[PDB]
C-alpha cells in the first residue's frame, strides 16, 4: 500500500484474499498451494529485484 495503515494498526483489511496460500475456509487447498508457498518462501525479504 502507498500508506501501509494495515501494518501500522495491525489490521488485516485485505491481505487475507491477497494470495491463494493464505488461510482458507475449511482448510480447502489452493490448486497451486505448494508452488505459491515455495515461491513466497524463496522470495521473502530479499526485495523484488533480487527475487525476480
Amino acid at each position: 500500500p502507498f500508506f501501509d495503515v494495515q501494518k501500522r494498526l495491525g489490521l488485516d483489511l485485505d491481505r487475507w484474499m491477497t494470495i491463494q496460500s493464505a488461510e482458507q475456509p475449511h482448510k480447502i487447498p489452493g490448486r497451486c498451494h505448494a508452488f505459491e508457498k515455495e515461491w513466497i518462501e524463496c522470495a521473502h525479504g530479499i526485495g523484488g529485484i533480487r527475487a525476480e
Partner: protein
C-alpha cells in the same frame, strides 16, 4: 457432446459482436442477455453454480430488465431496427469473420499468438483431479464474505447506500 464450453464461448463472442455493433438498444440488450445466458452456462460447466445463477438472477433479471425498461422509455419515434444501417451489418460481419478465422486458426494450429499465446488442446484438459468432499468449494468461498470479508462488506454496503443518495441527488433535476 464432447465440446460444450467451446460452442458456448463462440456463441458468447457472437452475441458480443451482435450487441457491440450497436443496433437499436433493444436488440443490443437482447444480444447482451443471450451472451449473459451462455456465459452463465459457461461458468455452470466449470462448477460455478452459484455464480452463474447470480449472473442470471441479478444481471439478466435485474440490471438487464432495468436496461430494457429504460430503453423502452428513452428511444426514437420509430425505434430503430438492426437492418436500418449498413454500418451495423458491416461491423457484425467483420466481427463474425474475425471470430471464424481465429477459431479456425486456433483449432487447426493450437499455437496462435494474437496478443496472448493460446492452445485449443481442449477445455476439459485444464481441470484438476480431486474430490471437494461434502461441500461446494465455491459456496464456502462466497459464504466467507461475512467471516473473512468484513472489510469488503463494509465498503460495498457503504457504496450501495451512497449510490442511493447519489441517484437521488442527480435525478432531482434542479
Amino acid at each position: 457432446t464432447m465440446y460444450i464450453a467451446f460452442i458456448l464461448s463462440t456463441i458468447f463472442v457472437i452475441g458480443f459482436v451482435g450487441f457491440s455493433s450497436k443496433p437499436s438498444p433493444i436488440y443490443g440488450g437482447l444480444g447482451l442477455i443471450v451472451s449473459g445466458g451462455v456465459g452463465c452456462g459457461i461458468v455452470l460447466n466449470f462448477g460455478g453454480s452459484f455464480l452463474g445463477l447470480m449472473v442470471f438472477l441479478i444481471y439478466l433479471g435485474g440490471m438487464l430488465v432495468v436496461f430494457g425498461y429504460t430503453t423502452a422509455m428513452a428511444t426514437e419515434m420509430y425505434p430503430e431496427v438492426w437492418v436500418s444501417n449498413k454500418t451495423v451489418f458491416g461491423a457484425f460481419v467483420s466481427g463474425l469473420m474475425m471470430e471464424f478465422c481465429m477459431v479456425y486458426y486456433a483449432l487447426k494450429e493450437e499455437e496462435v499468438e494474437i496478443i496472448f499465446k493460446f492452445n485449443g488442446l481442449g477445455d476439459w484438459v485444464i481441470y484438476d483431479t480431486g474430490d471437494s468432499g461434502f461441500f461446494s468449494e465455491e459456496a464456502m468461498g462466497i459464504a466467507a464474505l461475512y467471516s473473512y470479508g468484513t472489510w469488503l462488506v463494509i465498503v460495498t454496503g457503504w457504496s450501495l447506500l451512497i449510490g442511493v443518495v447519489v441517484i437521488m441527488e442527480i435525478t432531482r433535476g434542479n
